[PDB]
Amino acid sequence: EDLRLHLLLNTSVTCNDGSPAGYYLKESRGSRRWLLFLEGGWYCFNRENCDSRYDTMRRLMSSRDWPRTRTGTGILSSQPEENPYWWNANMVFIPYCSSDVWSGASSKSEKNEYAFMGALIIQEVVRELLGRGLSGAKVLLLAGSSAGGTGVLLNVDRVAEQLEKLGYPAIQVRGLADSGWFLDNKQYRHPTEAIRRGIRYWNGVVPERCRRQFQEGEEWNCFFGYKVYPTLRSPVFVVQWLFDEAQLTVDNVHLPVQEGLRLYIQNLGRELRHTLKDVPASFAPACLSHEIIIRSHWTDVQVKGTSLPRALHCWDRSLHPLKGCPVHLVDSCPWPHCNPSCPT
Ligand SMILES: O=c1[nH]nc2ccc(Sc3ccccc3Cl)nn12
Ligand SMILES: *[C@@H]1O[C@H](CO)[C@@H](O)[C@H](O)[C@H]1NC(C)=O
């Protein structure tokens, strides 16, 4: 319970239901490293599916029932045995309560049942943290899992742009996108369309260079990592299971596998591996799983003999190739769990 809740002092930056958004914070005085983690949890794209989400997933739409504390786990742990990478950093967990893949900039109003303010929540958290020690940071790592991982890709350059405009050009803004690198591929049996409808429903915003490439009506393209990543200026480390369970879910794959499905699964991993070929900081194990960075046993998986905490440390060193300390770690074996270190 080591991170303490702070609801946003600007109570107009709200969760879906108009309750104030917030963040959980554990300060580490003397550390100039700040980790801001974006929670995931899918999204909702119209009044009717948002109403259903409000009935049975309300913590993802409201702060009314949030606990006063949370325990930092995985990359958010302050214990060096659990977090070899950044155990001494200032830890921030930003709850996902906007249902908009962290892209929205719309308030609840006469015409809007729900507020979708994910992009503004991030910017307000950053602004309020500056008075709490973030002004002295040397590195701000914006991390996230699942919808939060996509949120990193959508927001990392805006955070960098915010800090420059606020007069803090010495803070190095970086991104860590976990399990948010998806493919707009063909389903195995019969997301782009839901993201398309969602952006309109949310007033969703995408990075500016990506917006300018794809232009009006096509901003949904920027929710897909392989399309938005090349447009980003901030350093971004991409973590993605080659056979992500959420990718298979949207592909209508549910796991004695016959030839058609075997070929589909192998092609997906290849598509995967191909989109990461030009991503120099990446960690992509050949496993059927979902998320990594805030799991307590995130240290266990290895690609080519290197763990993710090591790869992230090598990435830090690279931002000061390195002998025995690699940053590009993508499995080449073609089937789930061909890497023996995959989670059970
Ligand atoms: O939070 C979780 N867990 N698994 C998933 C899968 C997709 C999403 S949103 C999304 C993001 C980028 C592209 C397409 C979509 Cl649809 N969020 N999510
Ligand atoms: C509160 O947040 C809203 C939305 O970002 C912004 O328009 C407003 O100016 C903020 N208020 C203050 C006092 O910063």
Swiss-Prot record:
It is found in: Secreted. Keywords: Glycoprotein, Hydrolase, Phosphoprotein, Secreted, Serine esterase, Signal, Wnt signaling pathway. GO terms for cellular component: endoplasmic reticulum lumen; extracellular region. Glycans are attached at N10. Its EC number is 3.1.1.98. GO terms for biological process: bone development; negative regulation of canonical Wnt signaling pathway; negative regulation of Wnt signaling pathway; protein depalmitoleylation; regulation of bone mineralization; Wnt signaling pathway. GO terms for molecular function: palmitoleyl hydrolase activity; phospholipase C activity; protein-containing complex destabilizing activity. Rarely expressed in adult normal tissues. The keyword Signal applies. Induction: Up-regulated in hepatocellular carcinoma (HCC) with high intracellular beta-catenin. The keyword Metal-binding does not apply. Changing S146A: Abolishes enzyme activity. Unable to mediate serine depalmitoleoylation of WNT proteins. It catalyses: [Wnt protein]-O-(9Z)-hexadecenoyl-L-serine + H2O = [Wnt protein]-L-serine + (9Z)-hexadecenoate + H(+). The active site is at S146, D244, H290. Carboxylesterase that acts as a key negative regulator of the Wnt signaling pathway by specifically mediating depalmitoleoylation of WNT proteins. Serine palmitoleoylation of WNT proteins is required for efficient binding to frizzled receptors. Belongs to the pectinacetylesterase family. Notum subfamily. This is Palmitoleoyl-protein carboxylesterase NOTUM. It comes from Homo sapiens. The gene is NOTUM.
